[PDB]
Amino acid sequence: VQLVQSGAEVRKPGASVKVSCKASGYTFTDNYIHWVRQAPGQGLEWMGWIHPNSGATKYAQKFEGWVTMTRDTSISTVYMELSRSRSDDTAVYYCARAGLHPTTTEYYYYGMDVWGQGTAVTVSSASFKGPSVFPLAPAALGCLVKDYFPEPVTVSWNSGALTSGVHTFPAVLQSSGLYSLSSVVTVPSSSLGTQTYICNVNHKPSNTKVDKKVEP
Amino acid sequence: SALTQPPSVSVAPGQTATITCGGNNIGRKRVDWFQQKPGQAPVLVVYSGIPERFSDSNSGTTATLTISRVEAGDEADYYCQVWDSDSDHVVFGGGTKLTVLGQPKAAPSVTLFPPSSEELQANKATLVCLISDFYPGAVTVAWKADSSPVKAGVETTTPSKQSNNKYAASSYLSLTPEQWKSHRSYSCQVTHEGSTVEKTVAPT
Numbered sequence A: 001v002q003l004v005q006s007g008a009e010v011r012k013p014g015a016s017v018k019v020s021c022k023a024s025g026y027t028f029t030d031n032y033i034h035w036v037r038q039a040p041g042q043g044l045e046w047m048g049w050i051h052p053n054s055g056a057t058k059y060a061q062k063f064e065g066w067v068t069m070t071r072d073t074s075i076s077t078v079y080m081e082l083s084r085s086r087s088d089d090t091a092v093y094y095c096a097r098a099g100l101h102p103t104t105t106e107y108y109y110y111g112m113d114v115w116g117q118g119t120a121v122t123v124s125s126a127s128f129k130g131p132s133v134f135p136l137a138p139a140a141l142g143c144l145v146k147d148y149f150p151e152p153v154t155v156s157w158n159s160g161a162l163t164s165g166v167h168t169f170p171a172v173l174q175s176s177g178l179y180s181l182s183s184v185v186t187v188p189s190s191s192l193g194t195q196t197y198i199c200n201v202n203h204k205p206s207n208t209k210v211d212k213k214v215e216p
Numbered sequence B: 001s002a003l004t005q006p007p008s009v010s011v012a013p014g015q016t017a018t019i020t021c022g023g024n025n026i027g028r029k030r031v032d033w034f035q036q037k038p039g040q041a042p043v044l045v046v047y048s049g050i051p052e053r054f055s056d057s058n059s060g061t062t063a064t065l066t067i068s069r070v071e072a073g074d075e076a077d078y079y080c081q082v083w084d085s086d087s088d089h090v091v092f093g094g095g096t097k098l099t100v101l102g103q104p105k106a107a108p109s110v111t112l113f114p115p116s117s118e119e120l121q122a123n124k125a126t127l128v129c130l131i132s133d134f135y136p137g138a139v140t141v142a143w144k145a146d147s148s149p150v151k152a153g154v155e156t157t158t159p160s161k162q163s164n165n166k167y168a169a170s171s172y173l174s175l176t177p178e179q180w181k182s183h184r185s186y187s188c189q190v191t192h193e194g195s196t197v198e199k200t201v202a203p204t
Helices: B117-121 B177-182
Strands: A002-005 A009-011 A021-024 A048-050 A057-059 A091-093 A119-123 A132-136 A140-148 A166-168 A179-186 A201-203 A208-210 B008-011 B016-022 B032-036 B054-057 B062-068 B077-084 B089-092 B096-100 B109-113 B125-134 B140-145 B154-156 B167-175 B186-192 B195-201
Touching: A132 B117, A140 A201, A140 B109, A140 B125, A179 B125, A179 B167, B008 B016, B016 B096, B062 B077, B109 B186, B109 B195, B117 B125, B117 B177, B125 B140, B125 B177, B125 B186, B125 B195, B140 B154, B140 B167, B167 B177, B167 B186
Parallel strands: A009 A119, B008 B096
Antiparallel strands: A002 A021, A048 A057, A091 A119, A132 A140, A140 A179, A166 A179, A201 A208, B016 B062, B032 B077, B054 B062, B077 B089, B077 B096, B109 B125, B125 B167, B140 B186, B154 B167, B186 B195
């Protein structure tokens, strides 16, 4: 039994996100399905559960009124859309199934045993932008992809020919809302002038891919 | 209607880790335990003879999961939850960052690049301090320019581990082009476990 959630989401404030949780491997109407939400780099927080059979909804205290949890049964999937999102709602949302059967008759609450992948939802007021790649001259070489959104930019060197010393770093989100990352590759000092290195920064969301060259 | 969990716990490999989840009237309730390795979704923990590393134990007031014979694959966050029958809330814990301190120290190699020549044609400047292969995680980074610290525009990454299981981070210092050409030299004074590494660049 495995749960499959929807793809990653990136929406501006005011736009609605819908995370679908698909269940395969059991009688769909058997047990509950909860929706734990994890903030960026923080602890888990409960959102509520939905019984796919009856269709009832039980929402958490701070998640009521703006979170609607639906069910389909026909496609054997569960939803959890949030109409009119906000910039503080950026988080990784998780669906779970209460598959654990109680070890006692006193406390008959099924525990979460099967967990979905986790649809990383990112909500921010920034508009899409393409990374401007600059060369970092020199031993160690380097590249700079500056001021871009939304994550991710996939950086490799020489169209995948180089993997020895490449160490593409993590993006440092600036105050303006635009990300920025650098990629450095240590190449032998004797080779400079006898080898051409090219950044292969490729940013699909902005449809911007540039093979810029690093030269002294 | 709350559950307490310590923020950090450091245990040597092969020892015994003891995580606590403090509630009240939790004797009847059975607290489930979770394990969220970084990135991946949390996986619900499930407990001579058949040897057992994990033992779920509850004792009325504070229920403590005990990890025995700590392995490197146990380094993760651990959570606890229970159904509040009184208030009808499943209450999660704060999560305990179990850190396995088996790996030894490693001085951080620092690489610093000056503003690109193409940057300055756009009338903008951005230096870049790159600290790689550090350990454990302390990387206090300070920006000194022309023998004076510069704090305006310094932006540093929060440390994140890498493929070699050593932690590396980065720091950027946006600047005006007229200011960058004015001073004689710049420096990225990175401090780590009391030891400071420094690289210097100049407007050539």
